[PDB]
Amino acid sequence: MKNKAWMVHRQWFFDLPLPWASGATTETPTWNRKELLVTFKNAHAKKQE
Amino acid sequence: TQLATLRKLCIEGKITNITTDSRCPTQGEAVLPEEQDQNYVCKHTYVDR
Amino acid sequence: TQLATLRKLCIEGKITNITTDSRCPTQGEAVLPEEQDQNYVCKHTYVDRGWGNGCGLFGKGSLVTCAKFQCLEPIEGKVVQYENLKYTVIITVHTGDQ
Amino acid sequence: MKNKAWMVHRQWFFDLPLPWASGATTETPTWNRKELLVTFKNAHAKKQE
Amino acid sequence: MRCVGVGNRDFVEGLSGATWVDVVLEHGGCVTTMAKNKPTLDIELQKTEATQLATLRKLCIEGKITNITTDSRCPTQGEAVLPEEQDQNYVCKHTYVDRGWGNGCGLFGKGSLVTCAKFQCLEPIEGKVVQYENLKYTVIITVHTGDQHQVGNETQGVTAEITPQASTTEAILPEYGTLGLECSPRTGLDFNEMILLTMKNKAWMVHRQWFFDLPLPWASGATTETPTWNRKELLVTFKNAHAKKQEVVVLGSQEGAMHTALTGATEIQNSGGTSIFAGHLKCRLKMDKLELKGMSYAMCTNTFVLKKEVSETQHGTILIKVEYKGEDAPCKIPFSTEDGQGKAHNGRLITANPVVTKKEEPVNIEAEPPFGESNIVIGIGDNALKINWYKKGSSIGKMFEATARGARRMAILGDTAWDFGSVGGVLNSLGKMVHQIFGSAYTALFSGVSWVMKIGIGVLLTWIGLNSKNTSMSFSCIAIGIITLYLGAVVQA
Amino acid sequence: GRLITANPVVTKKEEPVNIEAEPPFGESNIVIGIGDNALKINWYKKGSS
Amino acid sequence: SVALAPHVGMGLDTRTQTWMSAEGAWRQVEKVETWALRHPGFTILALFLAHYIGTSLTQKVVIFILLMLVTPSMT
Amino acid sequence: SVALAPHVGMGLDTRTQTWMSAEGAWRQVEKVETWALRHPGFTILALFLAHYIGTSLTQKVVIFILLMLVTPSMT
Amino acid sequence: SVALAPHVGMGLDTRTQTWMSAEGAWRQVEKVETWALRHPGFTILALFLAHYIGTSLTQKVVIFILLMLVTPSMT
Amino acid sequence: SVALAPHVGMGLDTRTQTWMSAEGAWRQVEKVETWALRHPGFTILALFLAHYIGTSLTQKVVIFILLMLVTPSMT
Numbered sequence A, D: 001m002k003n004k005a006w007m008v009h010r011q012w013f014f015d016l017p018l019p020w021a022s023g024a025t026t027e028t029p030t031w032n033r034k035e036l037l038v039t040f041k042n043a044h045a046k047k048q049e
Numbered sequence B: 001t002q003l004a005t006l007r008k009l010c011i012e013g014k015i016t017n018i019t020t021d022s023r024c025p026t027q028g029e030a031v032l033p034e035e036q037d038q039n040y041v042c043k044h045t046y047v048d049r
Numbered sequence C: 001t002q003l004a005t006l007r008k009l010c011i012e013g014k015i016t017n018i019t020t021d022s023r024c025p026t027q028g029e030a031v032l033p034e035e036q037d038q039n040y041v042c043k044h045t046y047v048d049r050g051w052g053n054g055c056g057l058f059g060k061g062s063l064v065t066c067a068k069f070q071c072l073e074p075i076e077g078k079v080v081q082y083e084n085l086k087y088t089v090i091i092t093v094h095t096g097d098q
Numbered sequence E: 001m002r003c004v005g006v007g008n009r010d011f012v013e014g015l016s017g018a019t020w021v022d023v024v025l026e027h028g029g030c031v032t033t034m035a036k037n038k039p040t041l042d043i044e045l046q047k048t049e050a051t052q053l054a055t056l057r058k059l060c061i062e063g064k065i066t067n068i069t070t071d072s073r074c075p076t077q078g079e080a081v082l083p084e085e086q087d088q089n090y091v092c093k094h095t096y097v098d099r100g101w102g103n104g105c106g107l108f109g110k111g112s113l114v115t116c117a118k119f120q121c122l123e124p125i126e127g128k129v130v131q132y133e134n135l136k137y138t139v140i141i142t143v144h145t146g147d148q149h150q151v152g153n154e155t156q157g158v159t160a161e162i163t164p165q166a167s168t169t170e171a172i173l174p175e176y177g178t179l180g181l182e183c184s185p186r187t188g189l190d191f192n193e194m195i196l197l198t199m200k201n202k203a204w205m206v207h208r209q210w211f212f213d214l215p216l217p218w219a220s221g222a223t224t225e226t227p228t229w230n231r232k233e234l235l236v237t238f239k240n241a242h243a244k245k246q247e248v249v250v251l252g253s254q255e256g257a258m259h260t261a262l263t264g265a266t267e268i269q270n271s272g273g274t275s276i277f278a279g280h281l282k283c284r285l286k287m288d289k290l291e292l293k294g295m296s297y298a299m300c301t302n303t304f305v306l307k308k309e310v311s312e313t314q315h316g317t318i319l320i321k322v323e324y325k326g327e328d329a330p331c332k333i334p335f336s337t338e339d340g341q342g343k344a345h346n347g348r349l350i351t352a353n354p355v356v357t358k359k360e361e362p363v364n365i366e367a368e369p370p371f372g373e374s375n376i377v378i379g380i381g382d383n384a385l386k387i388n389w390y391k392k393g394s395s396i397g398k399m400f401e402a403t404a405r406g407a408r409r410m411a412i413l414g415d416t417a418w419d420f421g422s423v424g425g426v427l428n429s430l431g432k433m434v435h436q437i438f439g440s441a442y443t444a445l446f447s448g449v450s451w452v453m454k455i456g457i458g459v460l461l462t463w464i465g466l467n468s469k470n471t472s473m474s475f476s477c478i479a480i481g482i483i484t485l486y487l488g489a490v491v492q493a
Numbered sequence F: 001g002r003l004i005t006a007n008p009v010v011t012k013k014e015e016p017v018n019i020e021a022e023p024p025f026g027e028s029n030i031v032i033g034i035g036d037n038a039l040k041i042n043w044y045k046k047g048s049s
Numbered sequence G, H, I, J: 001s002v003a004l005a006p007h008v009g010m011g012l013d014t015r016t017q018t019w020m021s022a023e024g025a026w027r028q029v030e031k032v033e034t035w036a037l038r039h040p041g042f043t044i045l046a047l048f049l050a051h052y053i054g055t056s057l058t059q060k061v062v063i064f065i066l067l068m069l070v071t072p073s074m075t
């Protein structure tokens, strides 16, 4: 990531919770599990943002 | 050398377009046309009308 | 009269546009770019891959399939709200009449 | 359904194990729980359709 | 070579008297036959056709109703009969309806009522049977040739077709001698009680009695011009709104309820002539007429080089692909295994005779090292590159995996799995006999018990076994319970 | 087992003489002629003694 | 799969005759009986279970009959 | 009606995976669980029956669990 | 912060929703559970430690639950 | 989020130090310490629980230390 690199155990590299993609660099990645990053907040009843 | 890329993650977001829809009580869950695209994420919540 | 649909549910379905990708055994899961569509049904299963399947590392890799889904003859369950009932009652008198 | 109607309990109808839609008389529905109507035979372990 | 990493592939190192080894090759996966001073034969079952089927009885799923008729009687007149009731195409039912002066009957009360309906089912599913004298069992075998296009190939081998007409057949390998298959297709998976259940475009295999107890109207299957349906009443219902009158309604199609009605059934592809898969047959291998490629070749005297890396096969074996750049004649590939800090010879060549063919074919060697750290030297001379592979695991892990494989194999074939390696006979036969004696009664006892219910009854029997003051009762109940749980965890594969 | 027929003999070559025999219960092979090409017939009788 | 859990026992009805009254009413017990006729061995198994547990007679009957009613229905 | 008595338990199979393995395997217990969730009162009834009959504890458990398994399946 | 000490349980709550409740409800629990399913090796040691420490099933259970809960959350 | 569950003990041993050994060696204990300094109330509850559950000295001290570690971490 950025200008730095790392080595992480493979089993631990899928269980860290973030959106992930096929890694085909096709310029339009359809991200699996988009819900995890974006967060909905519902105020006291009423609208939703 | 000669690496292979798989599971590129995403560590930021930019929610550009937002849409909403409502339905009267006891009238089923309100669908939104922008639901079946491969780039939209959302959940259903309950509001008092 | 004047019923409200509420939710409908289908009985017969049709499947089109089969797609499939696979990974080498230790690469992890496999994802197709069309999985996020609500019209696609997906399932993950483990398949043994090898040099006969064009993968350098032998073992069991994940597999996934997709399918467009458009149900036919959907049955719909409507509800009747109270403000549209049409109860009627017919009464007769014991007239002397043939 | 088809040409015959029926009367059913609310919870029972909400627990029929078939994929449902919203019923918002939309142009195209967005089916919940599609997986339950279609099976995926896995002949041995070679491939599945 | 015909199969690597399939998951159920299992070696058989049998050298009996007169060199015949009995393997019961199931359809799911192959077997590999490593033998001393013989070419290691790899055998997998291929498509098992069975053509020219006989219809037997067919039964329908969707029905249609036409030509409604109805008569009624005054309450005390008795039953009512329509002149068309005796037709086998008409469905009839008697119900009591209240009649009166509003219905043009002088006497008030409840009179009988009857309805009729012509019946012609649509999309009838037909259940055919296969008699033994048309089976098309075929077996494709391959030899562990040094060849680059052999690592996991599925379209290279020698086809040995073995019908019950020709019970025993021999297949001639092109330059390795010949193999003698002494099979026994008649004792394979039962094919006189199973009934193919081809409907729409998908086929199925079902039990004889179960197919004779499907609650749908059937026909004879005599390929007549028009069928004569038995037990039509069960597909159509007769709503009786209050007590005024009744009409008839069909129950639509049934293909969904049918597809649900058979889950444990195995599926079979059916295109034209049926090509059913998933059957298993036992066979005897006459390996006494084999030769090992060329045993009169010289050993190589030049270098080797790895075109592609080595890799495991989840069975403790390696596939080393080697290209021989040395211009000299085709030569036997020298091989030795160097153990950790030792010159000892451990491990063996599954290929058993790796030889280069044309100096340009990267012929590949397949072997297994000891479970420690190993060194695989591949050539003669000091400049002979050493492939080093570290195979994770221990011998006891191999023992446990073998125990699991053996138990799982017994869970399917029953008594037939008792003989899968050498012929033996001194002690194998007695074990087979005793296990068959117990297992026929066992499988005749629990026939028809589900997943969770078999698990539950097993655990109930175990709990009974842990609460009795009798050695016999305790041991019998606990053994039966544990066996039942293990069988339930594998049943409905 | 037992050859239920007394001792079958081919009276004339042109048209077959048909044998009858009763094999044992177990799966047993049956040969006829002599040599490599001798016709051999497999059978599997169902049942026990 | 929908045929399991048929709409029955729910209280929503009247004296008007409902859908498939006689057929649906006797369907379940006919299926249980035919499954029992298919596999008589489980009768021996259930008799053994009833005999070796219960420590009474009415209890023996209850476990035997109800257990025999379970398996064809859980099938 | 044919969905009852599914083809299962009959011994005719091998290691090749059969029709609808996972779905069909878990279907029956899922249906039983959802029926139980629909009607919790029968849990009280079965507890009363188990408590007032059995004259033991393991027997109480056996009648309770098996009885609770019956009714959603006989439904 | 370092996102190791979430601002939770301060008591100054109101009817209105917090910043993130639907996820912070189960975040830490899911971390513990994914840890436990990933590594079962610690379970054997935790069972031993709870078992050989003075054993009354109350004490054994509380020690086992705490010891199995603390290591994941506080690595 | 991802900030939780570092692979501190992942076991891929190396000779050179890791990304942040200096901070990560003490960050968890720092969190516990600052949580305790912020909130002294939990100490009384932990002492009470240990005293009224701990039959012996060692059981009491183990219960106290586990309770005083789990809650600040689970916060």
Ligand SMILES: *[C@@H]1O[C@H](CO)[C@@H](O[C@@H]2O[C@H](CO)[C@@H](O[C@@H]3O[C@H](CO)[C@@H](O)[C@H](O)[C@@H]3O)[C@H](O)[C@H]2NC(C)=O)[C@H](O)[C@H]1NC(C)=O
Pocket (backbone or CB within 6 Å): C016, C017
């Ligand atoms: C799903 O599968 C179907 C076939 O099973 C695919 O239909 C095919 O779609 C392509 C592109 O839409 C069609 O090609 C078209 O041909 C015309 C001929 O002039 C050309 O001018 C267009 O530019 C286009 O390339 C193709 O005919 C069609 N095949 C059929 C209908 O049999 C479909 O694309 C798959 N995907 C989806 C989302 O439906």
Ligand SMILES: *[C@@H]1O[C@H](CO)[C@@H](O[C@@H]2O[C@H](CO)[C@@H](O[C@@H]3O[C@H](CO)[C@@H](O)[C@H](O)[C@@H]3O)[C@H](O)[C@H]2NC(C)=O)[C@H](O)[C@H]1NC(C)=O
Pocket (backbone or CB within 6 Å): E066, E067
């Ligand atoms: C079952 O019901 C159908 C209608 O639901 C009946 O079909 C009707 O049959 C009659 C006699 O076969 C047809 O009348 C014919 O009309 C031609 C017109 O020229 C006349 O020349 C013939 O002599 C004959 O009378 C009628 O058209 C036909 N209606 C249809 C087909 O809609 C049928 O008779 C009933 N019974 C059976 C056993 O099918």
Ligand SMILES: *[C@@H]1O[C@H](CO)[C@@H](O[C@@H]2O[C@H](CO)[C@@H](O)[C@H](O)[C@H]2NC(C)=O)[C@H](O)[C@H]1NC(C)=O
Pocket (backbone or CB within 6 Å): B016, B017, B018
């Ligand atoms: C979703 O949001 C995008 C964000 O830009 C919107 O696209 C704009 O649409 C308006 C309306 O016609 C145009 O005037 C702008 O020029 C558009 N901007 C861009 C960058 O395209 C629009 O609301 C949505 N876009 C979709 C649905 O494709």
Ligand SMILES: *[C@@H]1O[C@H](CO)[C@@H](O[C@@H]2O[C@H](CO)[C@@H](O)[C@H](O)[C@H]2NC(C)=O)[C@H](O)[C@H]1NC(C)=O
Pocket (backbone or CB within 6 Å): C052, E149, E150, E153, E154, E155, E156
């Ligand atoms: C399985 O073996 C066959 C036979 O060798 C392979 O088919 C050959 O493919 C090569 C490709 O370079 C051709 O040059 C040959 O002419 C083919 N031989 C034939 C068709 O008889 C096949 O490719 C092998 N399978 C795999 C997956 O490689």
